[model samples]
Target chain A: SKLDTFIQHAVNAVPVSGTSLISSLYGDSLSHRGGEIWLGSLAALLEGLGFGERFVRTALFRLNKEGWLDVSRIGRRSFYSLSDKGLRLTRRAESKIYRAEQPAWDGKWLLLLSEGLDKSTLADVKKQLIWQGFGALAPSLMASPSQKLADVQTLLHEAGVADNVIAFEAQIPLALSRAALRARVEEAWHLTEQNAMYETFIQSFRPLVPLLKEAADELTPERAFHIQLLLIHFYRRVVLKDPLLPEELLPAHWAGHTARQLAINIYQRVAPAALAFVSEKGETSVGELPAPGSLYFQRFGGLNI
Target chain B: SKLDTFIQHAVNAVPVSGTSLISSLYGDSLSHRGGEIWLGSLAALLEGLGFGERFVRTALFRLNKEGWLDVSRIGRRSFYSLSDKGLRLTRRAESKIYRAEQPAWDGKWLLLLSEGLDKSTLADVKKQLIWQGFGALAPSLMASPSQKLADVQTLLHEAGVADNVIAFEAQIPLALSRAALRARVEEAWHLTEQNAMYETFIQSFRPLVPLLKEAADELTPERAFHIQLLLIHFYRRVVLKDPLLPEELLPAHWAGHTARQLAINIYQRVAPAALAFVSEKGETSVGELPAPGSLYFQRFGGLNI
Candidate 1:
């Protein structure tokens, strides 16, 4: 019951939208085939996380309307699964969430230019491009080193402004000097705020590292589940705001790396128990959580676990 | 006298203005320091190149007005040399002209945006940006992979529109694909026209390779001088129009590489005699025309000479 209260408070503290919660659920817990959840089970899980039943129902209805969830009625029982687009988005987010390696920068940039779009179309384009990790350098231009030009093009095409957008690969010449351009990039991304967020993350997670090591065996399944979910939620909030600059490009004493290492250490130590809870919830008896050896966990490289 | 007639015809065939001819002379023949020519010697050189004395005087006056030539008077004689800006520009052009290596592209692009300039200012900005090797992607956006952001910033700052401009480094994401973006780049640079220019250069010079090899010993200093100058003139015209795409980004069997190699071969074979002529005209015996082992001639790499 104390663990339940802790779970409720951890979930309540974050104030995530209903859609985000469902996305995390599908992405982190129900990632395999037949990854459907009964309405009763989903409602119970949300209620446990401090969401009101009516609020949970409303969120589900909105997700269905937005094509992120497909619902099936089987003789008065409703089950939900991710829609195609929702599955794709969840997988994309999952890759980033589980990535253990930081990105390698080759001093190249991807620039996008969109002209002749209506206000709504331009707004949509901007939102989608930012979602793809691009930062706006000007009203009509957005750029990133994320090597996601193809994805931006696809997004624009999907947004119905493919014809209005042009993309290019570019490098700043030595004359413009990286130091000077980086200063401008720093201002544009408001990196001070991002750095502060990382600091906060480090402060919150670092103390748990030694604690996890000393008491990992004593951690319970339900407690591990709650902590892991909260860790992911907090990590996601801070890291998604990060431009995810390469280490060489980041400012001195960037706390992102430290925060990430702490998350990994804590996640691995608690994962077996957390996964056990997930397995039990699904009415399955999966074995011990495997070691973090896969690309899913090593996307950024240099993970201690 | 026969040499004079040959020089006159060669000069006449090219139809270059006085300032252009002088620019070329300084850029190619007088690249090293102490490169100034006496007023009398300059006149003699232009006369040999088929210009009337009056035309030479007028050209010199225009060059002085354009700040390309600094004039110094001593007794009844005068001397002229490149002004500071002129020398810098000539050296810059020289590097590009003699570059024996094609640039290697790492798939990054430098993008520029200037959205709030007046029509005249925008036109001026566009002209200068293109001169610095940027290609227009849209009305207000320009892109290049040659990495000249610093130079562009300087150009815009000098043009008084620095505050109106923004620059970025960018790359296309995989979702849109390099193959697709590259196709668009080809269209934007009008690479078909560039390829055709290379073909023309190759056709005009390929025939000279065997002839030079056969007549190497028989070739007189005067003849060598005339041929080399004409070859450089022609190559300059064609290659300056080229967008100079990186080797990997070029279309298959691009003739630019072949044409460049041919130019280098012809240049090296004739350089000794050309230098000999230059020395004789200056009435000074300069050092031996050393083997072309420097970066100037080795720019594109893989030269047989």
Candidate 2:
């Protein structure tokens, strides 16, 4: 089971206090698959692990502090997840310890939105709705995760496409999904004009190091903390499957750059280098890497570095 | 009328774009006592401000980035607020502009937890809750204007005070608000306590300047930018109050700080002289008053300050 896989990884990693050991395992299990697990259920699971009550409490608190866990409540019962960081770390650690790797899915398309509203907008909307816990999908349709129909109606009216909009709750098949993807691809496509400054910066260094390490070496501990925080932020900011990049995925400097330029820059610079470094080392190693442009680079950038 | 007051103040004090100006006005209105003007509905308010159509589209895109502003999709409409910074700024501006200044009630109580936890344990819990937006409120109650009941509930349970918690919302009577003045007269009853060095530094310096001014003669534009930023941050982080301290507030530290302690030490010593200068110039000057220390105090203590 995935939970078992996470537990085994936790056991093999650090020799944590017995309480922390159980909590780490528990947090890992809950954060799996980006799905939320209830605290009542999580507590039961911890008990199943033969963890004492005090240990369970301590472990839960510790995991949360480590950013490996998050909790949300429904009425009295709280739900927990391996935080995005926790999930990424767990998967990365699992891959390392278990040596399991999933093939990259080229079938999955990266939708880029440059301009020209197209059929793909509808399709992307449908995909996001489904994940919002909506169960269905369709085409030329606008689906919202609002759980309120009036909201959808108001949305359509306000969207200026009230005439063309319809709502759905299920998955639209691949052919239609592809059409949407193609539309977005067209929106994202660019021809000519490239610079590898960021890319060059990333690759020019000794084989890529985990972005965390690079960030740490480059920035003050505080800044490094914030930069490495992207590990936790990237997932929520960069969605996958249906729509790979949301507007939120745009760099903080979005208004200044063309959409295509931004995509290309990120692809060549931030994404590739970070991935390459992780591939060479591992997420843990990445966490340990010095921030990029640290005192180590003082000679390179003078006082600025 | 209160909205007009807010608009007048915003116009006089800062150069805000149209969208931000409206946000500022509405945000201040919400935080003001006896300042509720129902717009038929919130939608009406948005439409009145021209924030209607713009945010309707941008809201779903998650393009609403300001902390004071919030975006939620109910079917498809968005919501905005003056957020903490907004509230703080509004209150501060109001204090400056209005004949009768009423300090804004943050609508929540800050409870600082100074006891019962070890440093490591405190550090752990503080990090966890801080990420969720609880700032240092008093000694322990890290309060913020959050509607995330679920998050609060979860945090309490996780912190082991799930049962000891007593949560309630109340309107502080105008008469009782005199505590702010009474606090001045009754120093012993004041909640101020110097626990962490940072706290000590902030409390000592908080009153030095009502605000830091751009010292055109002594500092370059860039260095002055940093001094402004530190002032803003000191208030925002500690006071949890508004128009985010201009970016200038952080220019110096963003450039880099050798150590947080160094930054605190400098503030501890320099804040006094800055305050004294401001007070000498005018009574309204809100700068740090001088602390009792030598001109070359750093030489004796091996302190960077």
RMSD of 1: 10.1
Query: On residues A168-277, what C-alpha lDDT tens digit does candidate 2 reach at each position?
Result: 22211224223333332222321011112323223322232333334433433222221222221221122121122233222343321332233323223333233223
Worst 10 residues of 2 chain A by lDDT: A106-115
Candidate 2 lDDT over residue span B1-305, tens digit each = 33223223323443424444344334222333222222222333334323454554444233236554444334332334345565665655433222121244443322223233335655666656665555443333333333234556677667864433323222122232232322321222222321232354354444323323322234323222223223333323332222112122122222112223334443444433433332232111122223323322332233343
lDDT (tens digit, per residue) of candidate 1 on A185-276? 66666777888998987876676666666666767776787677777778877876787866655666777777777777777777668766
Instruction: For residues B86-198, write the lDDT of model 1, one tens digit per residue.
Output: 88877677667887467677766777766556789988888877777788865556878786666566677788876666666766544434454556567678888888888
TM-score of each model, in listed order? 0.54, 0.16
Per TM-score, the best of the predicted structures is 1
State, as a TM-score between 0 and 1, how close model 1 is to the true structure.
Answer: 0.54
Name the lDDT of candidate 1. 0.68
Against the reference, the lDDT scores of all candidates come to: 0.68, 0.34
Model 1 lDDT at residue B27: 66
